[PDB]
Every structure is written in C-alpha cells, then in structure tokens.
C-alpha cells in the first residue's frame, strides 16, 4: 500500500516507512502501485527510516521509442593551437537537410586520434599514414590538408575498415617472368584499350587495379616507367590472373574540411524484422536537428556530453562478447542509464517491451543505479 502525502509529496510503503522515489516504492511492493491520496493519517502515526534508491529516477515515463541513436562531434574552429571537441548524444529522430546530410560514397574527412591520422569514410574509418605522400596524392588528399580532433565515443562507434596501405609486392623490382615486354618490371602498371583498365605486374601473373591504386603504384616505385604502357585485349589472356588486395577506393576521395563541415555524426537506426540496424555517417554545418530543439541540450552531470533526448526509454543491448550477455536499461528523460536486473522487476515499473538500442551510444550515457527489489533496502 502506497500513500502520497498531500503537502510534502513524500511516499510511504507499508509491509510487515518513507520512500525516496516512486520507482523505489513500485519496485519493493512487487506491483506498479498507484498511490492513495491520504495528510494527518501518517503525520500523526508512526514514522520510520528512508528506504529506496536515491540515485534512481522519480518515475519511469517511457515515450515513443527513439528512432535514431546518434553521436555528434562538433569542432568550433579547426585553425587553433589545440582545438576543442564538443560531444552531443542525440536520442531522438534526426532532421536531415541541405546543410547537414549524410556523407557521399566518394566523400571523406580527416581526423587525429591519439597522435594518429584516420580517414572517416561512408562506412567507417581507415588508418592513413600521412607520410605516405604518394598514396595521399592518389586518393585526393591535398598537400595543404590538416586533420582535426575526434571524440573517443565517436571513434569507437566508427568501424575500423582497415588501413589505406598498398600491400607489399614480395618479388618487387624483379624482371617479368610472365613473358610481358621487358619494360614492364614486377611492381609496375599497364593500361589497356568505354573505360580503360589498369593491371599490376606480379610474380605469378597480373592482377587488375583501380585508378587510385594504379596512380599510387606508379608514384611509390615508377621504375623509370613514364606513363602506363598500353596492352592489347588478347595478350593479357595468355598471362595468368592474380588478385592484388588493394584497399584504395575507385573514385578519388573528396576531403571534407572542418571549416566548411564543422559537425561529424555517426547514427544508428533499428530496422524492422530480421534487418540489421542502419548505420549512417553524417557531416554538416549544424547538428542534425530542428531549430525548435536547439535549446534543449541537457549537459551531463558526470560526462562531457550534451544530451538531446525526447522522453524516457526502455532498451535492450546485445554485446557481441559472449562473457557479456544482453541487458535491459531504463533511460530517464535526462538521458541517464539505469540498469534493470530482470523481467519481473521491469514489470513492477510498468516497463514492457524493451526496444534494441546500440552499446555504442548507450555506453556513453551516465550510469546511475540498478532497479532491483533487493537494492531498495539501504
């Protein structure tokens, strides 16, 4: 039995005692108890000690589940001695437009993390050794390029999709044993007669190669071979086929500049059915949001993150590590993570149907206490 005080707004739970919060009183009774409007009936009677969790939220008001979970990285000015980064965690439906849209397939950005340069592309990130000057010239990074800083939260979210390093050619500099003209050396490139194709020379044949990789292969070695020589369409068939596993892209990459693109976001959207959440990479002038919501940034007490959440959430997280299972977490409207020990206890708060949220974004939220029946008595 729960009694709401008329003027103090204090809650008393009766079992065989006052309670800090409505969550604490609903957890202990084993049911989502609506409190009676009793004030002289408890103030004139016996009192006790304050039970319940203090760190827990007052109530658990879930709203419509959030469509997108997004990490946003904002760099006010790249041209600085040491630039500052502001992290925004948007747990709401995103607003896309001409100013802030998702990055194109042939588009990327340069970022510096822990004294290393990374190249944030469409689906992830790649380790670029900016000293590999010929490679950066083939990809499209200008000589006047400079990387900017990037958040740890955003860096972990962006999948590492391998470095942009040409694979070493084991018999480099050796003469062509395949029978191709003596000008062609092993570690060289050949062109052929709509769109022409480039081939790289290897010890046991030749392999096809995109323009970015052909450019970089010639610029890193050359071997005195000015311009790629032409080969017929037939002479290449007698020579065997090999596969160069070059990570470089086909079209040269347009490098976004932070002075034009001050916000870099990564976004996760749970999809229906057996689909895999759609992860998009977004860049722009501002945060991907409507103007009306620009003022509601909840600065996190215990974190360098500004939370733009809309209503409470009930979520389930599945980690790929087997030693880590799957966990339910309640997120209040302030954007604070509160773990839930079990299904029975989730039913005592009126929380049903936890939706899937990412570990990438939910891990960055401040972790408050756990909503267990056992943890109330303290």
UniProtKB/Swiss-Prot annotation:
Residues 1-47 are annotated as: Structural repeat A1/1. Belongs to the EccB family. The lineage of its organism: Bacteria, Bacillati, Actinomycetota, Actinomycetes, Mycobacteriales. It is found in: Cell inner membrane. Keywords: ATP-binding, Cell inner membrane, Cell membrane, Disulfide bond, Hydrolase, Membrane, Nucleotide-binding, Repeat, Transmembrane, Transmembrane helix, Transport. DNA conjugation in M.smegmatis is unidirectional with distinct donor and recipient strains; mc(2)155 is a donor strain while MKD8 is a recipient strain. Mutations in a donor strain that alter DNA transfer do not always alter DNA transfer in a recipient strain. This is ESX-1 secretion system ATPase EccB1. It is a single-pass membrane protein. Has a discontinuous central core of beta sheets stabilized by a disulfide bond that is flanked by 2 structural domain repeats on each side; the protein forms an elongated 'S'-shaped structure. Its main location: membrane. Residues 310-365 are annotated as: Structural repeat C2/4. Disruption phenotype: Increases efficiency of DNA conjugation when disrupted in donor strain. Loss of secretion of EsxA and EsxB, but not their expression. Residues 1-378 are periplasmic. It comes from Mycolicibacterium smegmatis (strain ATCC 700084 / mc(2)155). The keyword Mitochondrion does not apply. It comes from the Bacteria. Residues 187-241 are annotated as: Structural repeat A2/3. Disulfide bonds join 72-265.
